[PDB]
Amino acid sequence: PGLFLTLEGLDGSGKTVQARRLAAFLEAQGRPVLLTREPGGGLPEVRSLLLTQELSPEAEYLLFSADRAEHVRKVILPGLAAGKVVISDRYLDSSLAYQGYGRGLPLPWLREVAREATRGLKPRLTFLLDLPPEAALRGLEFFRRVREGYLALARAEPGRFVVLDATLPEEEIARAIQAHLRPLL
């Protein structure tokens, strides 16, 4: 009986660091953990390809969906099956925020593509590290659409999303994630 958790937000919102800290917290409790990430957790070559080329949004989404399809089947589901807590730095919500709200693809089609790609795997909890694009540690209108897109997703699924102020000190954010998670272990 595994537990699937995801972290979401702009690049530079603290995803990595908080994924790393949440893993250390679970290691400290003796709970087996698997840290992973998208894009590249399924097809690393999708990540590298897309560093240097820009494609239509449709094609970008489909490449990311291929990668996600492999990631789910070869990494996440097997980790869950072994009773691990599997933490993904980015998952489907990234595509919905970036390719959907950001680049304007229709959300119902994105979700229908995803339904087979993910085999319907949804995280139990998703932590959204929210901040404005100007506060991210690592064009402007686009990033605002993405940030507001994540907030919209979060509003629609208040039982799944936990929204944190990503401008808070690292350590504080980590303790809030822990408090949110304690009931589910």
Place this chain on the structure above:
Amino acid sequence: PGLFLTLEGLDGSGKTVQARRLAAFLEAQGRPVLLTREPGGGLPEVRSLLLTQELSPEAEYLLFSADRAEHVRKVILPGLAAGKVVISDRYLDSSLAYQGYGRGLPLPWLREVAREATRGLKPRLTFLLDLPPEAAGLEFFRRVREGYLALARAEPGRFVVLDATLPEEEIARAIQAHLRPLL
């Protein structure tokens, strides 16, 4: 206006030879033609990703779709918009026969993915080079072969099914005769 034609079949069916002979034939009639193909017509590098070992049928389809989405947008639709005859050696039916009939993916999901990927662009005619599957595992290739025949039965106006074991020049003459009314 533009005219969109595709060729389909198993590898070794002759569909590539016929697509090339068709392009030459239409260009020798002074017709503007654009010859393209999948995979790789949209995203040349897709061919690398498709060679990935142990690739899931879903991931394989999604990669072909990503190429296909780029191919439609950047090559095919602009070609048609300039009034070219655009001929693709393989198009969406290849995925339906290989990833659907061959690898078992559900057709309705394949189609729903395809609806944005392709922007609903359908060929006017599709020439299927029907090749017995042993001439191209074997159980997989039978499924793909029969799948193509099913796709053809389902859309008998679009598909022209040709016997791929006929001499090349007889096949080309048959393709030409199917085209003469639209040209």
